[model samples]
Target: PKLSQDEIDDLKDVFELFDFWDGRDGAVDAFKLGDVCRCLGINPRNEDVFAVGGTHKMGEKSLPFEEFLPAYEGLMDCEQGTFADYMEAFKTFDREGQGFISGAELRHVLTALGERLSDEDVDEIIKLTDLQEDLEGNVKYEDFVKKVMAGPYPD
Candidate 1:
């Protein structure tokens, strides 16, 4: 199968961004590269999907463009299930249909599901998503979806 035109354009954009760091050391710094993926809505913490080791590993300081491509492609193709389905599930936690779920609400749901997480554990989960801070303890559906789909959601 061939990549769609949109895919090609997206890949081009990613490559262009990588070029910004090419002159630095012929590669993109891991943290900078991670920021790019984060902006692209991809999960930078997924070792398997993002390639943390081997030749494709994000080296100590940077990741070569050649190595980054495969991971970028993987991210482009990653399935996040159906948005409708996720929204439906999210609505259950939303309770009041408020479009957002608080960390306390999430904790209540998790506890009801047989998971025993402390207040600290719930706070950590919110922090892990990298979408808190300004949100306080409130988590919007989109942010929740990103964290849930990315896995490694634990401590």
Candidate 2:
């Protein structure tokens, strides 16, 4: 979204005065380095930027880290985020004790993370995974790992 001069100035002032929004000191401690990858803005340690834009979704926002943070964190329930840990989340989804997750299982994963992706969204991700036979199409664990590794987070 295009910002008017007044909006831009207001945002600047907000950043100068806010501390929680600033992802500095321990603010970013919660994030795993991997979890922070491919983000558009300054890192979480730059809390001021997070404050300015973290909680809100401005138009044209592409900060992959911030945008995907909750979903990433929520799934793993880890207090800190890292690139390795982020990758682990996908692993957990794919393999883990329960093994490959079905569509319902995927929905459970999303709910655990306070995520609300549409059925289509889930279907798309599921489609990417390689499935076991019986001619049934599903996202099997190995396939999921392969796809995620192939996919670039741009970090």
Candidate 3:
């Protein structure tokens, strides 16, 4: 509704350009939703169809135009997890509830937990969170998770 009718029509046409279904009963990979949406002079990551998580959630299969239309506009409201979400998880890792966590522990836990992440991957993230880590490789996750999951927009 935010765009012109011509945009809506052309958006459908644009998606059909790659449909490969001869413009008939067409379906395309939802992962391409972000790609095609970009071609229509709208950037998906420009806070519209937000988050890698949204696109990640859709990459496994094909979807009809109906579903594509919904996702196009709806992803603006999509988010990874809430502040409380990460807060609770990080709290458990804090162990003694000392309001902080050790990167030394993160390197081990994230590398060995149920669905583990790689050492370098966890390292890269620790680098970002390290700004709040002052106690020699320790992170004050209590307030850090706030600025993290809550974004810069504030509480």
Q: Could you arrange the candidates by lDDT from highest to lowest? A: 3, 1, 2
Off by over 4 Å in 1: 1-23, 32-34, 38-61, 94-155
- Give me the displacement of residue 9 in model 2, in angstroms: 26
Off by over 4 Å in 3: 1-67, 71-80, 108-121, 127-132, 152-155
lDDT, candidate 1, 1-155, per-residue tens: 25566865665576567657555455676545555555555644444343543233444566666666565655555455576777787687776787888766666765555435467766676677665634466767676676667666455
lDDT of each: 0.60, 0.42, 0.63
State the local distance difference test value for candidate 3.
0.63
The TM-score between candidate 3 and the true structure equals 0.44
Better of 2 and 3 by lDDT: 3
lDDT of 2 by residue, 28-55 (tens): 3223322232232222322323433333
Per-residue lDDT of candidate 3, residues 1-155 (tens digit): 36567866887888788576433457776556677776655534534443432345554766677676667665434445666777788788876787778867756667786557678877676556544557577867766665444443454
- Cα lDDT, model 3, residue 140: 75
In terms of lDDT, the poorest run of 10 residues in model 2 is 33-42
